[PDB]
Each structure stands twice: as C-alpha cells, then as structure tokens.
Amino acid sequence: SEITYSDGTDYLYFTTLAEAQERMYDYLAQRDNVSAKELKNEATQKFYRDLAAKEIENGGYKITTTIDQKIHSAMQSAVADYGYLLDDGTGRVEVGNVLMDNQTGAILGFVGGRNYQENQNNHAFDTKRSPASTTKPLLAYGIAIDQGLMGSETILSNYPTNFANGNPIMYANSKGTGMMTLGEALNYSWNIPAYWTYRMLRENGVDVKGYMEKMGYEIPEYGIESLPMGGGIEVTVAQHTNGYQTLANNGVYHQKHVISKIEAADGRVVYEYQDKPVQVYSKATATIMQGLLREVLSSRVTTTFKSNLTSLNPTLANADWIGKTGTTNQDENMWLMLSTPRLTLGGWIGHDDNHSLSQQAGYSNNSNYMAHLVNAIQQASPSIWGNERFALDPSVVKSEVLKSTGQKPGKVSVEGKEVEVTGSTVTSYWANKSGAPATSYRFAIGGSDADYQNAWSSIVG
Ligand SMILES: [Cl-]
Ligand SMILES: [Cl-]
C-alpha cells in the first residue's frame, strides 16, 4: 500500500494519510450500505475510522496526490536553507506556505513549518489566523467592483473617522489623510477606504457571504465593522491561497485538494477528485483586480518582494507577478499572497503563541524569504510559473474620467451654485454595463459632510 507524489512513488506524509483516511471512510461506509442516520451514531463512526485506517495500512491501495516531487523537496530545502532569514529578533519565527495551481486547485508543494522534527504543527493546513489586509481584495474591493459600485480609478475617503464604538480608525500611526484612488488605497493598504467600502456593501445589502462561501470561507459574523481588515475572520494558508486562486484564475474558483485518486490494487476506483468549477467574480472584475494587484507589488510600498526577486533572478522577476500583504495590528501575523497566471503561492509567518514579530517582519524578512522560495521552485521546475500575462478581459468597460473625482467630467450643484469640472483625465476599468457615471457631489466612496467640502473647495481653485 503506497502514497504517490504526482508522477511516481513529512508533514506531507501525515497530511496525505489523513485526507486518504477520510476518503476510505466515505467509500467503506458506502460500500457497506451504511444508512443516512446510523453514521450519526458515534460508535459506528469510530469502527469505520478505524476500519479505513486499517484498509489503508495493509490493503495495497494506490493513492494518487497532486503533489510535485521536485517542487515540494525544493520547497523543503528552501525552508531549511533560508528559514533563518525569517528570524527577526523575536525568537524563532514559524511559517506556512502552499503552492497551488490556478486552473485546478491542485496543491503542488507546501511548507508545514521550519522543521518537522522540532515542531509538528502544520502551518500550511492547521494553524488558523486572521488574514489582516489581504482580506481587502476578496471581500471589499473585488466585490464592490463586481457589483458595479466601483471601477479602477474611483476615489475613496481616507479622512479621519471613527468606529461605531467611538475609537478612531488607524493605519499604523495615522489617523488618516484625504481622498485617494483605489490604487493608492491598495498599495499602501489604508484602512479607512476599506472600511467605507464594506460599509457601502452592507448599505446596499450585497450578498457578501454568497461570495465568501463560494470560495469555502467560513466567517461567523458578517456585520463586523473591521471585517475587510480581517477582524472576525480566521483562515489557514491553504484555504486562503484558494481565495487568491480565484482572483488569479479570472475569477473561477476551483476547490483546493491534495488527493486525485485512490484505486484498489486491481484498479477499482475507491475515490476520484471531481472538478466543481464556480464563477465567483465576473471575468471583468477578476481582471481589473489583477491589474490592481500588479501594482501593489511593483510599487513596493508594503513589500520588498519585486526587489529581492529581481536580484535573485531577473528573468523570473519579469513574469507577471501580482499580490497583497497583510499585517494584523500588533504585528503578530504577516501574510504575502503572490500569483502569476498559472500559480498562486500563499505565505504566512508568525509565532505559535501569538506574540509579536518585529515591525519589518512582513515588509522585509517574509518578502525576502518568499523571493528565495519562489526561486527554489522555478529552479526545480523551470516552466512552472509560466511566461503568460494577466490581461483585461474584452468585457471590461473602459470609461472616461477625471483624475480628481473618478467620475465623468460634468457640472455640479457645489452646495447651491454650479461648476463645469476639469483638470486632466484618466482611464477607469469598470465591471458593469456602462462605466463611470457623471461626476457628482458625493463622488467618493464614503466620506463625511465636513470633508466633502474640505475636498471640493480645494479640488477647485
Ligand atoms: Cl517591477
Ligand atoms: Cl525594495
């Protein structure tokens, strides 16, 4: 009886064992005609779990995993040789990563932690943590866009503002600034605009959990004001990677999996992964979203990745990389999600007890560690990342708008009066029918009464 890697023959052992055990259980139960309401009985369960365990250690099944040998060993050397770059002064830094194919959900290789021998917790598949700002594309902007409430150069308020509970909304030490583009909101990861976006989605009662649940996310309370910043959410790196699989495969989710097939010795098929593809964001949204995340990495505001990788390997650095970082407040978790059109790679770092990493752990160390990781992968499989490009889908609507309001040039009721509105203008990619609408008084997403006049008697004379 033998577990096989994609072609041929440590956390990997356990993790596979366990999925495979689970499946055998479903098959046994069902080959025995064990009834709907019998399998609820605990005792029957324990007999079947134990029976599946046994069928597998002594019955000669051929278990086929999606895992790629060369890749997954390279991801282990890479964490053995370069794991120490994660160590930032706050003790041993733990780490989890998952590589995934964007067309299939197949998981090709992962890193369960620094060293299975010193610490057995699986951080790729079992440690579960808030994702912080990397929630914002899935949950706030890609939805707003996909629902026609925004396009790529719409404006958003980052003026100081408060939670329901009175407290002010921070970004590090900043109480906030002024108005700003989606781009700038994404690249810096400002929290206020994100707050305002999710607030808008509630105001229109959008079916936000219809989106999240279609990628397999489990969030218990959708009404959290910090949700888009990651309050009220917790995920493993593997589930979360599958959320970035969705944005990268033009919005078609494919469910994450490790096992493709289990065959008895004589070919009977005990179990087969059966693709269940689901169109979560329109193609227009996912592609306008690709364009945005291309600049989160190029602009290097919240990660140094494009720099460390250009130096490690200039030609891979020119593949079409997109993604997003996250930092939970207090700095206990750092995330980097990366994608090329072919692959997604999720990475988390943190401490098993939850204390603090250093300020730069996400920004510099995980960024450079991931650059090594992404190198070791390509160096082991030179074509795997691909040389393809993310492209706006033909169905994106290109609209014609003002750098300054994000809406079409037009005239405004400037609180009793009138101005024809101008300055130079910029392309906006929209995922609706029709485009930007004509400018208006409340042009920006979110914003208080006070500030729409701070901003309008300014974005004038
Ligand atoms: Cl670049
Ligand atoms: Cl840099």
Nearest ligand by distance to the CA of 363? 2
DSSP-derived pairing of the beta strands 62-65 and 2-4: parallel
Give me the residues paired with residue 94 across strands: 350
d(CA 21, CA 9): 18
Q: From ligand 1's centre to the CA of 300, what distance in Å?
A: 9
Structure-block tokens of residue 341: 């059109």
Rounded to the nearest angstrom, the distance between the alpha carbon of 304 and the centre of ligand 1 is: 11
* C-alpha 369 to ligand 2 mean position (Å): 14
Give start and end residues of each alpha helix (H) in 3-41: 11-31
Q: Which DSSP helix (H) or strand (E) runs through 308? A: helix 305-312
| Amino acid (one-letter) located at 400 | E
For residue 350, how far is its CA from the centre of ligand 2 (angstroms)?
22
State the Cα–Cα distance between residues 125 and 11, nearest whole angstrom.
Answer: 10
Q: Which of 169, 92, 219 is nearest to 329 (CA)?
A: 169
Q: Phi/psi of residue 136, each to 5°?
A: -55, -40
DSSP 364: I
d(CA 308, CA 398): 34
CA of 93 to the centre of ligand 2 (A): 22
Here the tokens at position 340 are 């090329």
Q: Looking at the CA of 299, name the nearest ligand.
A: 1
> In the numeric block, which tokens belong to residue 345?
């790679």
The crossing angle, in degrees rounded to 10, of helices 42-58 and 11-31 is 120
The ligand that comes nearest to the alpha carbon of residue 298 is 1
141 touches 229 (CB < 8 A): no
Q: How far apart are CA 247 and CA 290, in angstroms?
A: 7
Q: What spacing in Å lies between the alpha carbon of 310 and ligand 2's midpoint?
A: 10
- DSSP, collapsed to helix, strand or coil, labels residue 98 as strand
Beta partners for residue 151, in sequence order: 430
3-state helix, strand, coil in the chain (%, to 5): 35, 20, 45
User: Which ligand neighbours the alpha carbon of 364 most closely?
Assistant: 2
Resolution limit in angstroms? 2.6
- Measured CA to CA, the distance from residue 72 to residue 77 in angstroms comes to 9
* Cα 95 to averaged position of ligand 2 atoms, centre (Å): 22
Closest listed ligand to the CA of 308: 2
Report how far ligand 1's centroid is from the alpha carbon of 130 (Å): 29
Cα–Cα distance measured from residue 386 to residue 382, given in angstroms and rounded to the nearest whole number: 9
Query: Alpha-carbon distance 430 to 387, whole Å?
Result: 27
Question: Of 146, 114, 43, 135, which Cα lies nearest the Cα of 349?
Answer: 114
Ligand 1 centroid – CA 289 distance (Å)? 18
Using CA atoms, how far apart are residues 63 and 1, in angstroms rounded to an integer?
A: 8
Matching CATH number, 68-257+274-395, of 3.40.710.10, 3.40.449.10, 3.40.640.10, 3.30.43.10: 3.40.710.10
The Å distance, Cα 66 to ligand 1 centre, comes to 32
Ligand 2 centre and the CA of 187: distance in Å? 14
- Residue pair 309/371 in contact (Cβ under 8 Å)? The answer is yes
User: Residue written as tokens 């999996």?
Assistant: 257
Neighbours of 84 (CB within 10 A): 13
Report residue 401: phi and psi, to 5°: -145, 180
| Residues with a beta carbon under 5 angstroms from ion ligand 2 | 300, 304, 307
Its sign, for the CA torsion 319, 113, 138, 369, is: negative
Distance from the CA of 299 to the center of ligand 1, in angstroms?
Answer: 8
Are 107 and 66 within 8 A, CB to CB? yes
Q: Quote the CA–CA distance of 252 and 408 in Å, as a whole number.
A: 31
Tokens of 282: 């329109």
User: Residue 275 and residue 135: Cα distance in Å, rounded?
Assistant: 26
What is the topology classification, in CATH, of domain 396-461? Rossmann fold (3.40.50)
Centre of ligand 1 from the C-alpha of residue 296, in Å: 10
Structure tokens at 170: 């921070």
CA angle 188, 194, 198 (to 5 degrees): 165
Looking at the DSSP bridge assignments, the partners of residue 324 are 337
What the block records as the tokens of 402 is 């003002």
> Within 10 Å of residue 190's Cβ, how many Cβ atoms?
22
CA of 378 to the centre of ligand 2 (A): 21
- Segment holding 243, helix H or strand E: helix 237-248
CB atoms within 10 A of CB 160: 16
Rg (CA), the chain: 24
Amino acid 432 reads N
Q: Which token pair is 137? A: 């594309």
Kindly tell me the burial class for residue 6, based on how many C-beta atoms sit within 10 Å of its own C-beta (0-12, 13-18, 19 or more).
Answer: middle
**Rounded CA separation 401/409 (Å):** 6
* CA atoms within 13 Å, Cβ hemisphere of 218: 6
Q: What is the Cα–Cα distance from 418 to 413, expressed in whole angstroms?
A: 5
**Nearest in space to 367 (alpha carbons), one of 337, 410, 328, 397:** 337
Q: What are the φ/ψ torsions at residue 295 (nearest 5 degrees)?
A: -80, -25
